[PDB]
Design a protein around this ligand. Structure first.
Ligand code: HG
Ligand code: HG
Lengths: 87, 85
DNA sequence: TAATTGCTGACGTCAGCATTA
DNA sequence: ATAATGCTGACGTCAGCAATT
């Protein structure tokens, strides 16, 4: 079965490929990789979405960090201005 | 041939005039399939370009928060100079 | 009221690079 | 040294949307 093909032990599978011709063995060995690849690619898509968002979220954080540091610059500059004049 | 993707509407329709309905259906599809193959290549290109622009966007920020930190720690000592005076 | 076009999200394939058994 | 596994970049199909024809 397709499902059973994807799911069995490295050994369990070998002990089940006995009667099948050698060229045929490879076809199903390729089928196992191909099938397993279908799974990996899916999981990769999810991960990529997570990674896309993460970078997006970093950017958000860096921007508010920029605002806040600018807001600090300005106030530290108000104090320097007022103290510069008295001095 | 596969340069079927090349010929324009006007060029193409006239090319089609010889063929049967069924043949037309087949060729028109191969065209969209071919045309789409190139479209996909475009979407990938367009994507790397804007993937980069984003990398630069972050890099310019990671540094912008440096001159800002340095600018504040500069204004710290400069404000104080006129504070202590 | 169609058809064609261009683009993009999502998939499944395949090649490569490690990592693991 | 083999074989298998998982992940990922890039690709080609296909669907379905938007905007032209
Ligand atoms: Hg990924
Ligand atoms: Hg794109």
């Amino acid at each position: 079965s397709d499902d059973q093909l994807v799911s069995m032990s490295v050994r369990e599978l070998n002990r089940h490929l006995r009667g099948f011709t050698k060229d045929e063995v490879i076809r199903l060995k390729q089928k196992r990789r191909t099938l397993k690849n279908r799974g990996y690619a899916q999981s990769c898509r999810y991960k990529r979405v997570q990674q896309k968002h993460h970078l997006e979220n970093e950017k958000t954080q860096l921007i508010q960090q920029v605002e806040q540091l600018k807001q600090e610059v300005s106030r530290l500059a108000r104090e320097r201005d007022a103290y510069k004049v008295k001095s």
